[PDB]
């Protein structure tokens, strides 16, 4: 069958950003329940099982724009590039920061999601398409194999 609302879709994909691959594998998701990033799900819409395709999905339809407000300078004294800090939220739900630069007392931190502001490039194979079982529809997600 073909990808649509309430189908469980199994894809084999590669993900590349700025020309470099960041991730790959096989996943199964329930289509039409906001389980995938919007742009990818849109690109999958209507595809027949067995289809292969590329899809460019811009930041606006993936992990959203990079909030320049999420970049801040914190004191070196406040800490206990590429540095990932899982520092405690102020009220709940921690937010991983990543340091981009540090000069003296000053440290530059970033609250944004890693892929924020990034256009994503996907190579995709639609491996299987079937209808969701009633349990999957209840939980609102795929129960793979």
């Amino acid at each position: 069958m073909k990808v649509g609302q309430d189908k469980v879709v199994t894809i084999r994909y590669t993900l590349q950003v700025e020309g470099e691959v960041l991730d790959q594998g096989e996943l199964s998701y329930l289509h039409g329940h906001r389980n995938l990033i919007p742009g990818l799900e849109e690109a999958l819409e209507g595809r027949e099982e067995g289809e292969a395709f590329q899809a460019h999905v811009p930041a606006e339809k993936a992990y959203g724009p990079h909030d320049p407000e999420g970049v801040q300078v914190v004191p070196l004294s406040a800490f206990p590039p590429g540095a990932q800090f899982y520092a405690q939220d102020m009220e709940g739900n921690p937010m991983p920061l990543t340091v981009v630069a540090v000069e003296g007392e000053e440290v530059t931190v970033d609250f944004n999601h890693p892929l924020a502001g990034k256009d994503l490039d996907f190579q995709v194979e639609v491996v299987k398409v079937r209808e969701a079982t009633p349990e999957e529809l209840l939980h609102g997600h795929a129960h793979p194999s």
Partner: peptide, 4 residues
């Protein structure tokens, strides 16, 4: 969410 996904790809994760």
């Amino acid at each position: 969410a996904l790809p994760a």
